[PDB]
Scaffold this active site. Sequence first.
Site, PDB file in Angstrom:
ATOM      1  N   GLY A  55       0.827  -1.189   0.000  1.00  0.00           N
ATOM      2  CA  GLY A  55       0.000   0.000   0.000  1.00  0.00           C
ATOM      3  C   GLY A  55       0.862   1.241   0.000  1.00  0.00           C
ATOM      4  O   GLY A  55       2.031   1.192  -0.380  1.00  0.00           O
ATOM      5  N   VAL A  66      34.778 -21.286 -35.420  1.00  0.00           N
ATOM      6  CA  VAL A  66      35.792 -20.298 -35.777  1.00  0.00           C
ATOM      7  C   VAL A  66      36.392 -20.658 -37.130  1.00  0.00           C
ATOM      8  O   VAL A  66      36.827 -21.792 -37.352  1.00  0.00           O
ATOM      9  CB  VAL A  66      36.865 -20.202 -34.682  1.00  0.00           C
ATOM     10  CG1 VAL A  66      37.472 -21.547 -34.413  1.00  0.00           C
ATOM     11  CG2 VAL A  66      37.946 -19.236 -35.095  1.00  0.00           C
ATOM     12  N   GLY A 126      40.088 -26.493 -35.711  1.00  0.00           N
ATOM     13  CA  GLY A 126      39.471 -27.573 -34.956  1.00  0.00           C
ATOM     14  C   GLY A 126      38.698 -28.567 -35.798  1.00  0.00           C
ATOM     15  O   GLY A 126      39.199 -29.045 -36.817  1.00  0.00           O
ATOM     16  N   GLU A 176      44.268 -13.821 -33.713  1.00  0.00           N
ATOM     17  CA  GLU A 176      45.434 -14.340 -34.411  1.00  0.00           C
ATOM     18  C   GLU A 176      45.217 -15.794 -34.803  1.00  0.00           C
ATOM     19  O   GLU A 176      44.515 -16.546 -34.122  1.00  0.00           O
ATOM     20  CB  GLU A 176      46.684 -14.233 -33.544  1.00  0.00           C
ATOM     21  CG  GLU A 176      47.296 -12.857 -33.499  1.00  0.00           C
ATOM     22  CD  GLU A 176      47.937 -12.567 -32.163  1.00  0.00           C
ATOM     23  OE1 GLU A 176      47.195 -12.423 -31.173  1.00  0.00           O
ATOM     24  OE2 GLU A 176      49.183 -12.490 -32.103  1.00  0.00           O
ATOM     25  N   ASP A 183      40.143 -23.054 -16.508  1.00  0.00           N
ATOM     26  CA  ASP A 183      40.067 -24.193 -17.425  1.00  0.00           C
ATOM     27  C   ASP A 183      41.305 -24.165 -18.319  1.00  0.00           C
ATOM     28  O   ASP A 183      41.324 -23.445 -19.319  1.00  0.00           O
ATOM     29  CB  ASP A 183      38.792 -24.145 -18.246  1.00  0.00           C
ATOM     30  CG  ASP A 183      38.468 -25.472 -18.890  1.00  0.00           C
ATOM     31  OD1 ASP A 183      39.306 -26.392 -18.808  1.00  0.00           O
ATOM     32  OD2 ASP A 183      37.375 -25.596 -19.481  1.00  0.00           O
ATOM     33  N   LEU A 238      36.913 -23.400 -42.774  1.00  0.00           N
ATOM     34  CA  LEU A 238      36.522 -23.516 -41.375  1.00  0.00           C
ATOM     35  C   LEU A 238      37.439 -24.522 -40.685  1.00  0.00           C
ATOM     36  O   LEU A 238      37.101 -25.072 -39.640  1.00  0.00           O
ATOM     37  CB  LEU A 238      35.067 -23.973 -41.270  1.00  0.00           C
ATOM     38  CG  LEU A 238      34.519 -24.311 -39.882  1.00  0.00           C
ATOM     39  CD1 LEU A 238      33.127 -23.727 -39.702  1.00  0.00           C
ATOM     40  CD2 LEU A 238      34.501 -25.815 -39.667  1.00  0.00           C
TER      41      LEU A 238
HETATM   42  N1  LIG Z   1      42.924 -18.300 -32.788  1.00  0.00           N
HETATM   43  C1  LIG Z   1      42.859 -19.529 -33.306  1.00  0.00           C
HETATM   44  N2  LIG Z   1      43.657 -19.944 -34.281  1.00  0.00           N
HETATM   45  C2  LIG Z   1      43.572 -21.180 -34.769  1.00  0.00           C
HETATM   46  N3  LIG Z   1      42.705 -22.090 -34.342  1.00  0.00           N
HETATM   47  C3  LIG Z   1      41.848 -21.782 -33.377  1.00  0.00           C
HETATM   48  C4  LIG Z   1      41.882 -20.461 -32.797  1.00  0.00           C
HETATM   49  N4  LIG Z   1      40.949 -20.413 -31.861  1.00  0.00           N
HETATM   50  C5  LIG Z   1      40.352 -21.618 -31.846  1.00  0.00           C
HETATM   51  N5  LIG Z   1      40.904 -22.427 -32.740  1.00  0.00           N
HETATM   52  C6  LIG Z   1      40.474 -23.791 -32.992  1.00  0.00           C
HETATM   53  O1  LIG Z   1      39.078 -23.690 -33.065  1.00  0.00           O
HETATM   54  C7  LIG Z   1      38.448 -24.843 -32.590  1.00  0.00           C
HETATM   55  C8  LIG Z   1      37.125 -24.429 -31.977  1.00  0.00           C
HETATM   56  O2  LIG Z   1      37.216 -23.117 -31.428  1.00  0.00           O
HETATM   57  P1  LIG Z   1      36.359 -22.784 -30.114  1.00  0.00           P
HETATM   58  O3  LIG Z   1      37.046 -21.775 -29.237  1.00  0.00           O
HETATM   59  O4  LIG Z   1      34.953 -22.540 -30.541  1.00  0.00           O
HETATM   60  O5  LIG Z   1      36.508 -24.200 -29.404  1.00  0.00           O
HETATM   61  P2  LIG Z   1      35.241 -24.982 -28.844  1.00  0.00           P
HETATM   62  O6  LIG Z   1      34.593 -24.061 -27.842  1.00  0.00           O
HETATM   63  O7  LIG Z   1      35.742 -26.338 -28.405  1.00  0.00           O
HETATM   64  O8  LIG Z   1      34.353 -25.171 -30.183  1.00  0.00           O
HETATM   65  P3  LIG Z   1      32.770 -24.900 -30.363  1.00  0.00           P
HETATM   66  O9  LIG Z   1      32.382 -23.747 -29.476  1.00  0.00           O
HETATM   67  O10 LIG Z   1      32.680 -24.580 -31.833  1.00  0.00           O
HETATM   68  O11 LIG Z   1      32.128 -26.203 -29.967  1.00  0.00           O
HETATM   69  C9  LIG Z   1      39.437 -25.386 -31.601  1.00  0.00           C
HETATM   70  O12 LIG Z   1      39.668 -26.742 -31.941  1.00  0.00           O
HETATM   71  C10 LIG Z   1      40.741 -24.691 -31.838  1.00  0.00           C
HETATM   72  O13 LIG Z   1      41.623 -25.689 -32.311  1.00  0.00           O
END
Ligand SMILES: Nc1ncnc2c1ncn2[C@@H]1O[C@H](COP(=O)(O)OP(=O)(O)OP(=O)(O)O)[C@@H](O)[C@H]1O
Lengths: 242, 636
Positions: free
Chosen positions: B11, B534, B529, B589, B635, B526
Amino acid sequence: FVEPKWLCKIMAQILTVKVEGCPKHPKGIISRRDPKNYMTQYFKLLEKFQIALVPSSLSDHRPVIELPHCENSEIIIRLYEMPYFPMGFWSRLINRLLEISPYMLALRPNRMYWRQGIYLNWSPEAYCLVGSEVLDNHPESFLKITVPSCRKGCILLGQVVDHIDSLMEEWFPGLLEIDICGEGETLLKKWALYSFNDGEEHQKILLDDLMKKAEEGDLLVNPDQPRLTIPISQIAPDLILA
Amino acid sequence: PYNRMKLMIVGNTGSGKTTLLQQLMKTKKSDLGMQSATVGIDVKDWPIQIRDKRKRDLVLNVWDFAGREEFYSTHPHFMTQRALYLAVYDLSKGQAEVDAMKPWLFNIKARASSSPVILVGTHLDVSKACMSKITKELLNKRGFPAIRDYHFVNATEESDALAKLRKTIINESLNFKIRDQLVVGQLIPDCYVELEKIILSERKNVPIEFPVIDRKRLLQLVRENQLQLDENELPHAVHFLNESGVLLHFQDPALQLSDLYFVEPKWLCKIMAQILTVKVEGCPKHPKGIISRRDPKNYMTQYFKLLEKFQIALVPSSLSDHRPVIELPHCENSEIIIRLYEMPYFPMGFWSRLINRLLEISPYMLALRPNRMYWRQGIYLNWSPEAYCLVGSEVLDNHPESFLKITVPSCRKGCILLGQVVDHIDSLMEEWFPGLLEIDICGEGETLLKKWALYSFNDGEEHQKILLDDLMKKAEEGDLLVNPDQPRLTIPISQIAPDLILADLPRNIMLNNDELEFEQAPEFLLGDGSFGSVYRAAYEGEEVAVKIFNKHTSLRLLRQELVVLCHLHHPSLISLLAAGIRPRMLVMELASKGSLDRLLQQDKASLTRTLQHRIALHVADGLRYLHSAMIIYRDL
Ligand SMILES: Nc1ncnc2c1ncn2[C@@H]1O[C@H](COP(=O)(O)OP(=O)(O)OP(=O)(O)O)[C@@H](O)[C@H]1O
Ligand SMILES: Nc1nc2c(ncn2[C@@H]2O[C@H](COP(=O)(O)OP(=O)(O)O)[C@@H](O)[C@H]2O)c(=O)[nH]1
């Protein structure tokens, strides 16, 4: 102006016109809201009479300012203890420093002036707060002016103390009048504040300007314990041409 | 089953709140011949043994909030979402008080959208009952929460009019049902109910001067009984007892009190409001709102070791309502950036929260503090006539809404402040009042908070700054310029909203699309990884790795992440190169030889006892810097 009773009545019609509508603006500020070309002549006289923004009826409540550097050694202070604020003091003072934008000379500083203060600041390294506080256990009325002790601040103090004195002797010349009868109270005791401890001094000791100005034979001030000393440049950089 | 609910009473400075409750609970005595207005919120609980076929003896604790407009700064702490809010007219001032009760209904909507509301006209003894029209006309279904009933009780004596209200409180409680759940009758582990019984049984055995309990004392109460809870159960257990209003406890890490467990909530809720009433009719040596530590055994020290923790310390409420006339240096319609926040009512604890989020941010332009002048509803912290920020609040003409104007100089040092205040003012809006920014698909998407932006083609003398909703303008990212139906002249969006465009962050990270050569659609680029997100691309003739963002990460969060990535700058940390929109990508990079796990999985012969070291030295060099900037990797 023939018939003085008329002009003296017009200058007070503006100070009573209120609006019980919408406070779209803060208290004290107002725009040109109203006959044959006279309204134009009107505040071609009010502005001439300085009453234009109405420096009176303006936000008495003061806003809490938190200065950047306030460690008892970066600020210069100068009280103006007088028994009562003269009638047209503030509306005259805050309208003498207001129109001075060319400080540090044409860069205008964003200012916030309530009824009894201005606080026009260019940067945390250069500001000037011409306030007015009431001390404890004191029925007088003070005029505290705090300025940063740097180079850009030594100018503002020496430039405000001028305007506030060019106003005192021009308008109220009997304030600064030596009453030789009795004693030389002078009715306006422009103190200066200094502290040997740069910080945590727990107080800033008063020092009358008249007595301190006579201490120009040397350049340093120091207490009855003469180990440590303060350069007068720091506490009153206007008596010394700094 | 757990039968315990919260019944908030609500109120405004004169109603049947504390005198209607005494009849709802059927407190037969009310021995005080003359009671006084409420201080705090007066937490109490009454059981309801429904003498019927159903032996469910639910006990819901009432929180008869104080109505006086000076405690409002603290109420949003105690307006939870598991509750059934009341509301009281004071029909004696018929058709004029229902208007004065919209703010309460709005904050109920802002805090707890999915909770019921039961308007209770408290006056019949004294007269005007056509107020059921406006409540059905304007107050029923327009942005306000779900009003589920409305009664006109007498509020001073038991009567048929009041008895049917006590019955609606029951039937509305036993049918709460948020997301089809029926809250009042859920199942919980008996380990909690027994923990509830010992805290209540301990409330009688604690120093009244400080009923607080430390976790040390708590971890012994379970030892006295045979409670099967462990150190991993209490942080959840003692929270489920918090939502039920048995004890107050705050898990925030910044507020270093998580060892303090507030039993007897009605006490802490009363202490936090003793400071907001202590006035001094002596000397106003200070301006209104500011106050120093003027007052037992070490408790006073504990006192504002909680008030400051509760943000109420300088009292951001009761602070110079009258605003001071500011005259900004450069105000020629083209040097200032403005952004309104039109909302129907200022939420309860908005300003005291806002001006205490921007206040503590002195490290803008980063530690040079700006000399500021904050009244009740503004801050205006300014560094120089070339860099300032005035988070004001004005009322427009012919408009009953409440706006939040923020004017900032359009220079470089000003594009930062806007993009940095709009963050804090949004990180607060979704953290505290999440139902403001909630798309009400029913009817139309009014969204209850329309963050306008202001722009003008004429740099000066435009005679007006045209509104432009941010939602509609954000969709105009396909290009970079805005322009009217007369398309001769145009305005760069950087100027009017430099936060949607990533212009506030360091200038070196503007995307500069003219050089970025990048093919999103194909997967053979692409390669980073495996089946990831990325990609690989080229930026300024060199090889980089752009990171396309999916629909999950909203722009408000992408802008929230880049601000910390932009200032790491270590030779052992992946450094940014650009970031932009079209689409929301992030350039970094290109690690030529890929991640390490892929190496020691198929190229175990490349590590050669001196590359095994330089890797470990460069990773211990990164941790030598992260742990220096007080940030843990978490991590690795
Ligand atoms: N700056 C970079 N240069 C080259 N390779 C990279 C770079 N950053 C990430 N990667 C490669 O990109 C892949 C995926 O990148 P991300 O950070 O998304 O990893 P993730 O979280 O395991 O993948 P996602 O989110 O796609 O499931 C990784 O395997 C890594 O080897
Ligand atoms: N005659 C009459 N008096 C009421 C009624 N409701 C409340 N009051 C009076 O108003 C006051 C109510 O306290 P209350 O306003 O609930 O406290 P607050 O709402 O917590 O500030 C008491 O003095 C009651 O005697 C009512 O329905 N009839």
